[PDB]
Amino acid sequence: NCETSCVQQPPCFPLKIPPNDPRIKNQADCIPFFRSCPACPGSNITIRNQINALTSFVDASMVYGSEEPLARNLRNMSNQLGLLAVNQRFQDNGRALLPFDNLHDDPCLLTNRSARIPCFLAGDTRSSEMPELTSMHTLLLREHNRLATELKSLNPRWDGERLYQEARKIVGAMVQIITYRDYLPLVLGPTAMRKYLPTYRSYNDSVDPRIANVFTNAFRYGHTLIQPFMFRLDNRYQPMEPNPRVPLSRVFFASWRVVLEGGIDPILRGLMATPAKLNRQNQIAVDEIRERLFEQVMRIGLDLPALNMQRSRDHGLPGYNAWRRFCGLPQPETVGQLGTVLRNLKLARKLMEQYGTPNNIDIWMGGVSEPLKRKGRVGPLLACIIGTQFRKLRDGDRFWWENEGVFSMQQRQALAQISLPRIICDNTGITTVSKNNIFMSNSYPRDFVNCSTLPALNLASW
Amino acid sequence: NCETSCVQQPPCFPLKIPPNDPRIKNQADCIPFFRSCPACPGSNITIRNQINALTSFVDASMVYGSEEPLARNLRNMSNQLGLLAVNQRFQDNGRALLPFDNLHDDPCLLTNRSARIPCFLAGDTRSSEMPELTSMHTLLLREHNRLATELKSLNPRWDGERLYQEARKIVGAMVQIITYRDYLPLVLGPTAMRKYLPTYRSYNDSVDPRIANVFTNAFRYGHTLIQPFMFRLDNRYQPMEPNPRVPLSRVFFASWRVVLEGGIDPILRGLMATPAKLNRQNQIAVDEIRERLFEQVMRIGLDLPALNMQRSRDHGLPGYNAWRRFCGLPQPETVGQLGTVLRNLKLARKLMEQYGTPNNIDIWMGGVSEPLKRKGRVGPLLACIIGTQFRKLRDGDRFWWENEGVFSMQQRQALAQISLPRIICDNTGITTVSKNNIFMSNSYPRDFVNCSTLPALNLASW
Amino acid sequence: CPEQDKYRTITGMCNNRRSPTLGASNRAFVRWLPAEYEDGFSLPYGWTPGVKRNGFPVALARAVSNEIVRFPTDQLTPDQERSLMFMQWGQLLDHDLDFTPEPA
Amino acid sequence: CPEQDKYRTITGMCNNRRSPTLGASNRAFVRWLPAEYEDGFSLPYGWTPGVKRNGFPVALARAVSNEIVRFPTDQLTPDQERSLMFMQWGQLLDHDLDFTPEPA
Ligand code: HEM
Ligand code: HEM
Ligand SMILES: *[C@@H]1O[C@H](CO)[C@@H](O[C@@H]2O[C@H](CO)[C@@H](O)[C@H](O)[C@H]2NC(C)=O)[C@H](O)[C@H]1NC(C)=O
Ligand SMILES: *[C@@H]1O[C@H](CO)[C@@H](O[C@@H]2O[C@H](CO)[C@@H](O)[C@H](O)[C@H]2NC(C)=O)[C@H](O)[C@H]1NC(C)=O
Ligand SMILES: *[C@@H]1O[C@H](CO)[C@@H](O[C@@H]2O[C@H](CO)[C@@H](O)[C@H](O)[C@H]2NC(C)=O)[C@H](O)[C@H]1NC(C)=O
Ligand SMILES: *[C@@H]1O[C@H](CO)[C@@H](O[C@@H]2O[C@H](CO)[C@@H](O)[C@H](O)[C@H]2NC(C)=O)[C@H](O)[C@H]1NC(C)=O
Ligand SMILES: *[C@@H]1O[C@H](CO)[C@@H](O[C@@H]2O[C@H](CO)[C@@H](O)[C@H](O)[C@H]2NC(C)=O)[C@H](O)[C@H]1NC(C)=O
Ligand SMILES: *[C@H]1O[C@H](CO)[C@@H](O[C@@H]2O[C@H](CO)[C@@H](O)[C@H](O)[C@H]2NC(C)=O)[C@H](O)[C@H]1NC(C)=O
Ligand SMILES: [Ca+2]
Ligand SMILES: [Ca+2]
Numbered sequence A, B: 001n002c003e004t005s006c007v008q009q010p011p012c013f014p015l016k017i018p019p020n021d022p023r024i025k026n027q028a029d030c031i032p033f034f035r036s037c038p039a040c041p042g043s044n045i046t047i048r049n050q051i052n053a054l055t056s057f058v059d060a061s062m063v064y065g066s067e068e069p070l071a072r073n074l075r076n077m078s079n080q081l082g083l084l085a086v087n088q089r090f091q092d093n094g095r096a097l098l099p100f101d102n103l104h105d106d107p108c109l110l111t112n113r114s115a116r117i118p119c120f121l122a123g124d125t126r127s128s129e130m131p132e133l134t135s136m137h138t139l140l141l142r143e144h145n146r147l148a149t150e151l152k153s154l155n156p157r158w159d160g161e162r163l164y165q166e167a168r169k170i171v172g173a174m175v176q177i178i179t180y181r182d183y184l185p186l187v188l189g190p191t192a193m194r195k196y197l198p199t200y201r202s203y204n205d206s207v208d209p210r211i212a213n214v215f216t217n218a219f220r221y222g223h224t225l226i227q228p229f230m231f232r233l234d235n236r237y238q239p240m241e242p243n244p245r246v247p248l249s250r251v252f253f254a255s256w257r258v259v260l261e262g263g264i265d266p267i268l269r270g271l272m273a274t275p276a277k278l279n280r281q282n283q284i285a286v287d288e289i290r291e292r293l294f295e296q297v298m299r300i301g302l303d304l305p306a307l308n309m310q311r312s313r314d315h316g317l318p319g320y321n322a323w324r325r326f327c328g329l330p331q332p333e334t335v336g337q338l339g340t341v342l343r344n345l346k347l348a349r350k351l352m353e354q355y356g357t358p359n360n361i362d363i364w365m366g367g368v369s370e371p372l373k374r375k376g377r378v379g380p381l382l383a384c385i386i387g388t389q390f391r392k393l394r395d396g397d398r399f400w401w402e403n404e405g406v407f408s409m410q411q412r413q414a415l416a417q418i419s420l421p422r423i424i425c426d427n428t429g430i431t432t433v434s435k436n437n438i439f440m441s442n443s444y445p446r447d448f449v450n451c452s453t454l455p456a457l458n459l460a461s462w
Numbered sequence C, D: 001c002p003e004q005d006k007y008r009t010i011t012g013m014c015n016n017r018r019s020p021t022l023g024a025s026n027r028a029f030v031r032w033l034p035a036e037y038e039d040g041f042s043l044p045y046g047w048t049p050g051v052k053r054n055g056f057p058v059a060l061a062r063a064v065s066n067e068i069v070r071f072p073t074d075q076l077t078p079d080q081e082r083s084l085m086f087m088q089w090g091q092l093l094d095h096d097l098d099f100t101p102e103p104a
Helices: A068-073 A133-154 A160-188 A190-196 A215-225 A255-260 A265-271 A304-314 A335-343 A347-354 A363-368 A380-387 A409-416 A420-426 B068-072 B131-154 B160-180 B191-196 B215-224 B255-259 B304-315 B322-326 B335-342 B345-355 B363-369 B380-395 B409-415 B420-426 C061-069 C085-097 D061-069 D084-097
Strands: A229-231 A245-247 A275-277 B229-231 B245-247 B275-277 C078-083 D078-083
Touching (some): A133 A160, A133 C085, A160 A190, A160 A380, A160 C085, A215 A304, A215 A363, A215 A380, A215 C085, A304 C061, B131 B160, B131 B255, B131 B420, B131 D084, B160 B409, B160 B420, B160 D084, B191 B380, B215 B304, B215 D084, B304 D061, B322 B363, B345 B363, B345 D061, B363 B380, B363 D061
Antiparallel strands (some): A229 A245, A275 C078, B275 D078
């Protein structure tokens, strides 16, 4: 049991501990870590590789599913209405809520032992990690219910699947089109953007749309953005005093909070009007996840950063230089070469105490610790690395919204003017969303707007 | 069993015949095919890849071996004399022959029920294919027992492993140096070479030294170089008389031919005096190997170029427009475009009916049918495809003689004086040899020189 | 793969026509650089003790977090130009793209 | 992986001090372009019938060998610029780089 033993054997590969750990005061203790399932059971002559359970393509997998069984498991088929399945036992206020996974080991049952809330049932196996992730799966869920209900108004004679599939496309676009129009530019960087992501042109039959085993690590650059609290705001956009700011340690897996604690908006309203923590070389990851990752549920509490560094190892990714090399980027050989590259005489200095040579830094550290891109939120390595994967994901993909055969010229026009705030206004119960680039806006009075000064989708062409 | 059987069933993947075969006149027959062994038996997510038993390095594996039970078994371990084990009892003219293999299904024995000449044991499992191929293995077997010797003359206290190991180096070195200098540039072009083999700055720990699945098929371009018979000449270089030209068919797996019919010399040379075959779109490959491949040892004789395309489907390689694209070259998507490319309306209209789309033609096909490159003998596909693999074995091999820590400067100096002709001089009974760039001089009044007009080594420098 | 598609497949299968398997479900990860294990084939560096990566010992994960990452949770700097939904699209997006199974 | 090799390995286990397995013996092939199978992961393109490669019926290999390969052995053409030793180093070379097994 690698959630309970500390023996370095089989399935396990445990995080042992330094004798001078703030938290863990026993050298015989660890942090519970299993190993990523191989692509070929039975090492012989094939180098081990891990597997991707989900789909590369930017499909709205997290909504719909990844495999046949679960997909059909997530729908109302006691109808031809073409809808997603939703909770028959609890309501938002009137709005839907996700169904409940049926697990023999429910962990969201562990937050509150005095409330029956198992965890939501979604496209993804981890919709409950955080109550806000869930708020999103609950929002996009609403749109393929909203849209199918509306698509039934225009094309009445449409079947049940047609009504659902077609709805699917409308959402896969909502996600794709934001990621690419309102997310990359910003994680990305005005400069890196014109390189990793030039403008669309056609579809490359020959573009590995597959997601690379590194991005699996390089995309975790995000952990550095988390805030140690879960913020709920009313709809005077003020501290929602059931209780407005809760430590992130006592929310992990807590659906109860979502269902009994006030609904999905008070959350959505915090994601929008409270700043995102910013990464600095002095402030990498906050403790609520460095020492309190899942405890209200697990044995001892985990160290994300640390958990990131070991998969590093379990998924035989090479280090911070192969990568650097791998991206026409110079490769620091020395503390000075480093101090210079990083623009840090300290960090570089510190990284070298840990690692002998940069040749050996686990990606995540070198990645989250290089200086931020000009107007970005990522450095060149990640930058390069991260954009080099969203590029293929675009040209690779046969069902890219902008590909010739998918969405007619009008549909396209239409699609082009959707926005995430409008999605948020359409299916939530809030009235003043954020103005453009919610990824960017975040102050109340101002760097926001009302929900009418907002366009609308037009299904007139569908 | 796939030799005696035609079902489409597992180990097998047979070659159905067509309506109007020349050799094979019955639509219920097939030339046999055992498919290639997977890297993961019992996989359902792994994309099928095949194994490579050998070493990609230009180590001299075919002489030394690539597995270490084998290997130990080729050295003679009685003395401390570092030495390749020789034929216990059946020798040349007092010059070594290869050992004998111990095999449960010795094909080379099926050639002359009467004589006992089994397959020769050595580096590669298939050195008995052509008596003209075994002969080289002998020659390399030789320089090894020889260098070892003379080194024993320049350094005594030097043990066995060391006298052999040093000798082994000297060899893989000869084969490297001679393949990068006097063979490749004639089998690739001048240019290709300037686009593929730039000079050797140094070794790159980040170059992928392994063998590409495709090269596997691209290297068989040479199948078009082969000549209908086996020529063996007398010390005067004319028509040699046990019997001059033996058709390539009574030679497959013909060890007796070497032992009994008349030395390694008569072939080793005459190999040296006979113009290689020349490829052209009206003489792709021939019947001696189209319709007689291994037939005195098999049930029906394979069709070479056919196992080739079929071996290609096996590997699961992409067609001719992918690689056309992988290399930076144009991708004709029309018969019209096709002639433009292989300057041959006639074959384009041909290829196009075989295959519908130029995009589905087998690399072999596409490969071999491209016009030869100027001064070379490979298409722009194959030049690219052969030029790049070679570029990497060199740059991704820490044991390439030119690396700066393998052999000393000093060592290297005479080391670049080694020429095959001398190799085939010191080790054989032959006097008069063909001049520098053995590969490029068929002619014989002169197109040859004597054995004094050729330098030697300087183990001195050892 | 069909002879012709309005909608995507769920397991993401015939997307690409030459390699039906590309960017699909319960399929292997791609490799942009050869793997770097201790064995050479299948054992995480940071596995045997006494094993070194390139010439140096291998750090400990709980070890470097302790050093490079631990920061006084109250010195937090709020990124004034980005909003918390920016991080959420991050998690959600990631979840659309990858997942790597353990063996419960 | 050892320190100061004066000589090579044999199986090639450690040329790449970083990916030791690399270039080695009895490890699998590399693929510079995805694999194209008829199911997408393991069935020869010409395996099941009526299965088209990419809108076209997979042509028989005996037949391609016949229609474009065939020739009147009598019209051979001596490569006057190169000798066999050239076609015989091809092998000595192949024979040192690759080899893929079948099962008896
Ligand atoms: C906020 C933006 C985030 C991004 C972009 C992100 C990204 C990633 C990615 C890509 C993975 C590996 C994916 C896989 O193969 O399974 C990962 C792992 C993980 N994340 Fe997140 N993550 C974020 C937030 C969080 C949060 C909020 C938590 C904690 C509440 C967290 C907990 C974890 C855990 C437990 C793992 C597994 C660690 C391991 O096995 O190595 N993540 N995340
Ligand atoms: C002369 C230069 C030659 C070159 C460069 C060459 C190259 C190739 C290559 C690369 C392969 C596959 C390698 C492997 O997977 O192990 C192959 C297969 C084969 N070759 Fe050649 N070869 C040559 C000569 C010959 C000759 C002269 C013969 C017969 C006289 C021959 C008979 C075969 C056979 C029977 C196969 C197996 C067919 C299959 O299933 O793929 N080769 N050779
Ligand atoms: C399937 O769809 C139905 C209809 O939208 C869902 O809700 C019920 O629908 C019927 C008829 O349309 C109404 O009379 C009921 O009042 C509806 N629900 C309730 C609680 O009153 C139904 O819930 C859907 N299936 C799932 C699993 O949610
Ligand atoms: C060693 O070879 C590698 C590959 O041939 C070179 O690495 C590539 O460099 C380009 C820049 O032109 C990068 O965009 C690629 O991502 C790199 N790939 C890899 C695998 O490294 C490398 O530059 C060469 N090293 C030297 C010192 O010349
Ligand atoms: C091992 O080396 C010996 C030494 O050359 C090989 O042949 C013997 O050589 C000695 C010279 O010291 C002769 O006096 C013997 O007569 C040779 N052997 C025979 C059978 O006469 C020996 O052949 C080598 N081992 C193998 C397996 O070839
Ligand atoms: C089969 O192999 C044998 C092996 O010696 C060849 O041997 C010939 O045998 C005859 C009679 O037994 C001798 O008169 C010849 O002198 C041998 N050959 C030579 C060059 O001397 C034999 O020719 C081969 N072919 C057949 C069809 O048996
Ligand atoms: C589709 O993408 C591939 C890869 O991004 C492009 O092909 C590459 O072109 C370079 C330039 O000569 C070659 O060196 C690479 O080897 C190619 N890769 C492959 C996989 O072939 C291709 O040009 C793109 N096609 C189009 C029409 O944009
Ligand atoms: C788990 O859920 C129960 C029920 O929602 C929580 O207790 C509730 O507390 C609120 C606020 O103080 C009261 O309005 C409810 O009436 C309480 N429930 C009951 C059954 O009386 C409980 O606090 C939650 N767990 C924790 C640790 O707070
Ligand atoms: Ca997906
Ligand atoms: Ca070799």
